[PDB]
RNA sequence: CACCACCAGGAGUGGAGCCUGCGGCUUAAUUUGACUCAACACGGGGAAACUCACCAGGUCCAGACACAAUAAGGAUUGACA
Ligand SMILES: [Mg+2]
Ligand SMILES: [Mg+2]
């Protein structure tokens with residue numbers, strides 16, 4: 632439970648339609664006040680998705696949430712991309728790089744837990 | 753036995769001009785069914801479009817669902833001039 636509970640803050644976020652999944656979507660979404668928590672890959676390739684979304688979320692005003700995690704293929708199952716098959720093993724999905732969140736669909740204590748790790752260590 | 757037969761009759765039709773239905777001819781198409789009574793102002797069929805089925809052209813999917821493929825560093829949709 633050492634900071635891999637970001638799945639459950641994302642999973643309750645999806646049920647209240649609050650993930651602007653996708654490089655195009657996220658970049659559009661976080662170029663407004665919608666940017667509420669952001670999740671990034673470490674690096675996929677060629678370093679420029681890494682440059683681009685970081686510079687937009689590093690604006691000179693308060694809107695700087697940023698969380699740095701591992702490769703994208705896991706991350707799509709960490710978000711909602713449907714591969715349930717009513718819990719069956721089959722992965723029919725792809726992996727996203729940048730998920731930006733709006734409104735997080737919840738009141739979770741893990742939601743309480745997560746920002747504090749984002750704030751204090 | 754019977755004016756969907758005759759008798760004694762009446763009013764006609766068949767002639768004419770138009771209206772309408774069928775065959776034919778023509779047509780890109782002149783959509784089609786029904787040929788004695790028991791087909792032919794019949795399909796309640798008096799069709800400008802629609803009806804509409806025919807002809808000449810142009811859109812759309814309104815091809816459920818399942819399994820594969822594709823694919824959030826975009827599977828696909830819409831459009832101003
Ligand atoms: Mg006459
Ligand atoms: Mg007729």
Ligand SMILES: [Mg+2]
Nearest residue numbers: 773794795797
């Ligand atoms: Mg007729």
Ligand SMILES: [Mg+2]
Nearest residue numbers: 804805806807
């Ligand atoms: Mg037709």
